[PDB]
């Protein structure tokens, strides 16, 4: 794109907004009324520091050539250096604040804080993890029972191909057999009168096989055996006996 | 007249899609399949397609069982459908608010 | 990822992350080191885990490898072990992410449709995952095995 | 729609350009492109 | 959508004409093949899942596209593509019953290439899967119904290419 | 068309055509031949049908051709006979389609608005259609006339 | 949206690879800075209104755009623009927590230039207001978190320009 | 929408100005013609159906567009087009009362050419029907109100062409 | 381009009319002011460089836009903007001589806002520089010619905003 | 451009196929009608000026578009439109000789609606002039060649609408 | 175009700054790798034809796109695509020498997706051919230069997708 290239990002300029009370220090009278102080050394007055002093060339002549005595890379930093340039006061530009430094945060290689840490993390996520697992198996039990109770076997379901895959699933997992069609499109049936009549016997009346072959299927009150199922007596129906016609048979209805 | 002129005149139209549309709604005393196919029609309108390719299966199950039992109206099922985690994942996360 | 999910759940409400969400992100980044260690252990013991899970599956479900079963033959058995390796890799992803988003977005959404279209019994896959769970938890400590089986259990629940 | 009907496509006539915008919405397939069909209405003179 | 009858009536109505001998010719042609069309549609509705399964097995089941990096690697993508194939089969059956591919133009092909290009779905593999489905479908329904169905299968493939 | 309407009604529910709808499509394609024959007979006797219907209308409704009536003058009477020919053509379309979709989509939707904007009494058009119905049913057999008047009756009901 | 962890896992998964030493390098890098990220996000959530107020005061509060004829003259427009700045700050915070600007692409920058161009919103003034917000935010959160936040601020400004 | 008064107030407010002599000039101009505008609007509301009927009779009633093949052949299309003409007349009356065509831009012309092009409605015949309606309307309301109404009729025709 | 004479002739010719009393009114109006227009155009041609120099000095010479980061910092940009101001002055002079701003529409304003937006040129500063040029130009040419020139200066500023 | 032979060869070559029985069917069909095509092209070349003159006389010669205000009022516009009609006739003859309308797509219809819309040329009047030219041309060349020519005339009208 | 040095100088100049320690850091970084860059560029210039030949042979040489119906079936298309691959390799080499992908944005990616979409060139196959070229190029130039070149190869693929 070249060298002198305009960017909105790098435009610190009031040209797109017309704030006509802002320019650059020009007159000597501008230091008392409009301008404050340079924010860096590039913006400094020519040949002076950011604070207004004459710039001195920053480095001397090392006395005491010696690796053990004499200043070297191991020498500690004299505290009066930061005092000399005024970096110890909070209103100075070079005032360092270590509370938000990266160095203040905790090391992660330290095993100690790591094991202190993981327990605190598990403590929060335990409840939500358990809740989501409970929800998943709730959904599974619900679909098993509505598979066993006739849902998903109406012919509007058996026409779509995903309904056919669900029927093959229900068959393959031995949950229930869904009567579909023959290869040429005619409805299956065990008694040729009406369509979709399925077989029965010896497994329509067995318990504990509601979701057979489904791994750890918790359906109902799995934590106990079930009541003995006996009520072999007839209660007279008062005002609720189905009144039928005399000397005839209710054909159909 | 020829195939080019006839094809131009047969197509001039809003579209036949406007006439060739059917509405779903609960009438009196529906069975449980009738409720199911209405719920599946809602999933195609709010999600634009059948759900089974972009969900696990346990996300709107309690909403389906509730509508099939006759406990919530069509409007409540659509409201509950629109504020599910499925709707949030498909039509809110990948797009801007506009 | 926990950070991602916190950010979206805070984004829908048009608010910054509350101090609870930030607390939880902090606890997560603090436990990331043992998360990486556990992922290490599960990752580099993959061969034994897949092998021993395949054994327990084939002894518990001899029909799938019986003559004609879905995984019948050398190639089909290799493909089934490939699937088990897929799911072990996803479990390691979920362990490092701190949440089942990687497992669920890859390998759980639409898994029933895929396995029904392939003709594979999903209960057999659930059995294989359970066997791999036992084998993998055998190699961890108490608390580590508890936290690691936390994801196998979710994968089993989603695969009912 | 009331409380009994499922929403549907609804070809509109007199909302002033609701027709072509609705047609573009429903005639596009899911995830067809990244475009936003109605980013805003073009500004009118006034407030 | 317009079927053969609707198309003939439209061609006659767009000229202010009554249905003359050529319209009767086309109408008889459709009425003679309607029963074969119904038979084929029933048989295809019977075996949609097996048709899709066999086409996928013969076309792209063991190729590299189902491998990591392929477009249909994860379970989401596999399920999405088998749903797409189900769409294609169902709409081809509709077109065969109607005797007119206008439903394919209005409900399937409109903006499909652009969606696939934005998603990154390979078009050649899709066309080959549809071609494999054409084989199985013609196989199952016999020669005449297979040619009828292959007409609309090739229509979809040409609209996609 | 019956096929089209069955397809849309099955499409809204997201299901294939049930065996009842396929049964009805089959019965329709089987009767298509006598449908074409009846359309033949009605089509090629159009001049007598329009003429004799126009007579019965003008004798039953002398006001429309009386001095100043809507169809008063040579040109207006010709235009009214043109309209009757339009509706006979639409009835033939409906007979071949097996359903009133062609008649209703062309000539019935918004017919009251059009005839009110033109200043034409819609009851006169209904009378003309009834007269044409009697004339046309006179030329058919018993069952054929019954099936053909089936559409004239719908056109009359829509034109009340 | 994908964070740093999701991006690393995706790069590894798109090649059928296990997480090797470079993935561990990036993951450790994110895990070391996560706590600083949480601190910065908390502090920014604390002072959002004051940050927006100070940025608006230093950038466009007394310029000519707030006078009659300016884009944000009436009260509707002033409120709308401060809401926009709140959006930018919140989404930059999300991006800083995630360590990945993909949320900015998906939820912010997608179709934003076109909306602003149709409305007539000046883009340069918006970019300058975001730059002023970057100053105040880095000021409030300190040097390291300020550089992190400024990364996503500059990302938004580049996507807008 | 903005009328003449709203437009003058906006032009004055967008400069931070008080309403000076030129604004008073325009405001007096509108206030002098307001009563004629109300008279014309009442008369047009009285005879809308007859105006549309006569315009249709003189413009496109016996042409080939009303015959088979033409746009507006069937009864649906005839009713739709007379409803369109009613829309045009009502909105032209609104614009004449307001003394400003901005309502036509916001509520009528926005996306109208594109809708007509997608539907296949002939634009030239529509413009000619609007021109015929302009004749009858100016006829019924007299010279001054007819010129006022014809201003907005021509505005609609220019926005449609 | 069309001047006042061309516009009057076009308005008369587009109706098949001969030039009647109102056309004569407008033509006399232009012919009476033509000599003042020629005087003003000569004086403006005499002092174009000084006009641009003084307008730039009073409008944007010492602002922050000429400082590093401004849009007109480097020498390329300074030269480009003074060339732009020369364009504006020359075309305003053409429009004043012609008595018709159509040349400004055809040769200046067509696609200017879009070019400036793509380049990043601040529109407000440009409008203010044109306003300052209007002051100096009216100053130099006197009251009547200054109002004439300010008409087209304001036309350019309105077309740019 | 591709004629019928080129199109058949391309359809066969794009599949790696040799020319089978269906290609022979189409090729024989073209070869049987080639001589009639040459006769019609010669006759049309003989009477192009009279065809255009008669079509213009029957379609738009005395309408209001030739009067002041109408498109084609001045002599420039009249000459331009008769040149356009000559273009349409010549390219329809090319398409009839080739038996393929691809030359019309490549050399005529590409960007024609946009040019006419930018110029302000009425599309409906143009389509009606082409329809009138179709009448005269079919008249002069007889029934079969007239249907052949009307195919491409209607192709141009559909591409223009 | 701007290289690494130009980009550093621009970043420093756009703030009125002298080149400070960070600029020196980046400049030293570029100067240390320049000699490796020159070596890689020479080696790539040596073997461009063989690189393109091997990439085409491994990526799309025997696929169905080179057969009838495929995009690069005829000899024109084959030559055009190998010329395209030569373009990509040469511009990636330029970008590697410069250490900055701006030349790819200015001279390659600008309007490339739109050209390919108008022509019908498959984007996925192109990206895969570029990926295969990345393999061979990294192979030939060794690990470090291969990573450098793969940076710009992936840049082109991302700009194309
Ligand atoms: C308020 C501004 C506004 C207008 C004007 C408008 C027009 C509009 N006109 C329409 C249709 C139509 N418009 C016409 C009009 C005409 N046919 C002709 O031949 C004539 C030249 C012309 C009448 C002068 C016709 C025939 C249709 C029906 C198209 C169809 O059924 O395919 C439709 C489709 C909606 C529907 O009927 O279902 C809309 C939305 N919408 C608006 O919001
Ligand atoms: C990352 C998530 C993910 C999964 C899980 C996945 C599964 C997947 N399993 C497949 C096959 C298969 N999977 C099995 C698996 C089994 N057979 C049994 O009896 C057992 C119950 C079970 C093993 C535990 C078999 C036998 C096949 C081959 C089926 C065939 O080709 O007929 C295939 C087709 C071929 C291939 O592997 O590329 C896919 C795509 N893809 C994915 O992206
Ligand atoms: C009724 C006409 C119609 C079609 C066909 C249609 C397709 C369609 N296919 C989609 C995705 C898809 N389609 C495929 C398909 C395939 N992958 C392959 O490798 C094969 C070649 C191919 C199957 C043969 C895949 C994998 C996706 C998922 C893309 C993704 O998740 O990124 C999506 C994105 C919606 C979503 O899944 O969230 C749509 C809308 N939409 C329609 O309205
Ligand atoms: C295909 C469906 C369809 C219909 C029905 C139709 C009717 C239609 N009837 C018309 C006129 C007319 N129609 C009549 C009819 C009658 N006068 C009477 O008194 C009787 C009650 C009645 C005859 C039975 C008359 C008199 C006119 C001319 C009205 C006039 O010009 O003033 C016109 C205007 C001129 C024209 O014919 O083009 C149309 C468009 N258009 C259609 O597309
Ligand atoms: C990076 C390349 C570059 C250059 C060189 C540049 C020059 C430049 N010189 C300027 C002024 C000026 N320059 C001078 C310079 C001089 N007077 C003399 O007698 C000497 C011959 C000469 C000094 C050696 C003066 C006096 C002004 C102020 C003129 C005025 O305001 O009247 C100005 C207007 C005010 C400002 O400084 O912002 C610019 C933009 N801009 C650029 O982008
Ligand atoms: C005849 C009508 C007409 C105009 C007006 C026009 C303007 C125009 N101004 C341009 C640039 C420019 N225009 C300016 C102008 C300004 N900078 C500011 O800060 C001020 C507010 C403003 C001057 C008042 C600048 C600085 C550039 C250079 C942009 C760049 O180098 O990136 C360019 C780019 C061409 C080039 O310099 O290479 C064109 C084409 N073109 C035309 O055909
Ligand atoms: C403003 C410039 C301009 C001119 C000049 C113009 C001429 C023009 N002259 C015309 C006809 C005509 N012009 C004439 C003229 C003549 N017959 C003779 O023998 C004489 C030599 C000559 C009279 C001096 C005739 C006879 C017609 C009718 C031709 C016909 O319809 O067959 C027509 C067609 C009908 C109509 O008038 O609308 C036009 C457009 N149009 C324009 O826009
Ligand atoms: C329809 C016009 C047309 C032509 C001609 C064509 C040629 C063509 N020739 C090829 C290869 C080839 N062609 C040859 C041919 C020869 N070796 C010799 O020594 C002989 C001189 C010559 C045989 C007479 C060989 C050996 C290859 C393989 C080169 C390789 O893979 O290294 C390839 C790459 C692989 C492939 O066949 O798909 C193309 C595309 N493509 C076209 O579209």
Automatic annotation (TrEMBL), chain A:
Name used for this protein in its record: Uncharacterized protein
Automatic annotation (TrEMBL), chains C, F:
Alphabetized UniProt keyword annotations: Antenna complex, Bile pigment, Chloroplast, Chromophore, Electron transport, Membrane, Photosynthesis, Phycobilisome, Plastid, Thylakoid, Transport
Subcellular localization(s) per the UniProt record: Plastid, Chloroplast thylakoid membrane
GO biological-process terms attached to the record: photosynthesis
Keyword hit for Glycoprotein: no
Any one Pfam family match given in the protein's UniProt record, by short name: Phycobilisome
Modification N4-methylasparagine occurs at: 70
GO cellular component, one term: chloroplast thylakoid membrane
Family: Belongs to the phycobiliprotein family.
Name listed for the protein in its UniProt record: Allophycocyanin alpha subunit
From TrEMBL, chain D:
Subcellular location(s) of the protein: Plastid, Chloroplast thylakoid membrane
Its job: This protein is postulated to act both as terminal energy acceptor and as a linker polypeptide that stabilizes the phycobilisome architecture. May have intrinsic bilin lyase activity.
Family recorded in the similarity comment: Belongs to the phycobilisome linker protein family.
Protein name: Phycobiliprotein ApcE
First and last residues shown, out of full length: 832 to 878 of 879
UniProtKB/TrEMBL annotation, chains E, G, H, I, J, K:
Main location class: plastid
Keywords: Antenna complex, Bile pigment, Chloroplast, Chromophore, Electron transport, Membrane, Methylation, Photosynthesis, Phycobilisome, Plastid, Thylakoid, Transport
N4-methylasparagine modified-residue sites: 71
InterPro entries per record: Allophycocyanin_b, Globin-like_sf, Phycobilisome_asu/bsu, Phycobilisome_asu/bsu_sf
Gene3D superfamilies registered for this protein in UniProt: Phycocyanins
Membrane topology: Peripheral membrane protein
Subcellular location: Plastid, Chloroplast thylakoid membrane
Binding site for (2R,3E)-phycocyanobilin: 71, 76, 81
Family assignment from sequence similarity: Belongs to the phycobiliprotein family.
Name of the protein: Allophycocyanin beta subunit
Source organism of the structure: Porphyridium purpureum
Lineage, broadest ranks: Eukaryota, Rhodophyta, Bangiophyceae, Porphyridiales, Porphyridiaceae
Encoding gene per record: apcB
